[PDB]
Amino acid sequence: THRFVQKVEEMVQNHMTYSLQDVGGDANWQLVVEEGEMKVYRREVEENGIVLDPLKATHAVKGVTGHEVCNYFWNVDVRNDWETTIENFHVVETLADNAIIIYQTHKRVWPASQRDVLYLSVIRKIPALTENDPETWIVCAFSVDHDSAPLNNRCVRAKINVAMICQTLVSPPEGNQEISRDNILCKITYVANVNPGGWAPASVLRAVAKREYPKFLKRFTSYVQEKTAGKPILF
C-alpha cells in the first residue's frame, strides 16, 4: 500500500534472485572468515576510488525458525540486547505493520567521524511455491531519503543495502511425539553492501568488516537461540 512498496518488492526480488546463489564455488568471491557453521565471504570491489566490498555470510542455526530469526533481527524493541555498533536510533516513520523507516548513528568502529544511516527496514514472508519447499523470511534494510532526517554536519551518511534471508528445515520425528526444537534448523544468508561514505583507508575498512560482521552474526544467532529456548515454536 505505502509509497515504497515497489522499491521494497524490487529489493526483495533482487535478494531472492541474486543473494541466494552459492558463492562457495564463485571464484570472484573469497572466504575470509570461518567459525563453526558460519562462513563469511567478500568480493573486493572499488568504484571511483571507494571500497564497496560486497559481503555475504551463510550460517545454519539449530533449534530456531526463519520466522523467529527475522522477527528478532527486525524488532527494534530488542536491538539493544544484541547489537553493539549502534549508538542511537529511532523510528522516523511507520509505513506499515512490517515496514519502518529508521534513523541511526553508529559508534566509531575506526578512528573517524561517526556514521549515520537512514533506511527502510521491512520484514516479509515469501511464500513457498510448493509445500515441499521452505518458505522464506527476509528482512531488507536499505537506504532511503526522508525530509525529517536530512544530512547533518556531525556524521557521515552511510548508504546500505542489507538483507537477512532465512529458511527453516523441519524434520518431523518418529512416534506420537510432537516436533521439538531438536527437529528444526534455520539456514541463514546475510548480505551487506555498504558505502561507508566519506573516505577511509581500504586496509582499515577491510579489517573492520572482517571483524564486525562475524562478531555480529555469532552474537545475534546465539541470542535468538537463548531467547527461544524452551518456548513454543513460532513457524
Ligand SMILES: CCCCCCCCCC(=O)OC[C@H](CO)OC(=O)CCCCCCCCC
Ligand atoms: C563497516 C563495518 C560494518 C559494521 C557491521 C554491522 C553489523 C550490524 C548488523 C546489521 O545488519 O544490523 C541490522 C539492523 C536490523 O534491521 O539494521 C542495521 O543496523 C543495518 C546496519 C548496516 C551496517 C551499517 C554499516 C555502516 C557503518 C559504518
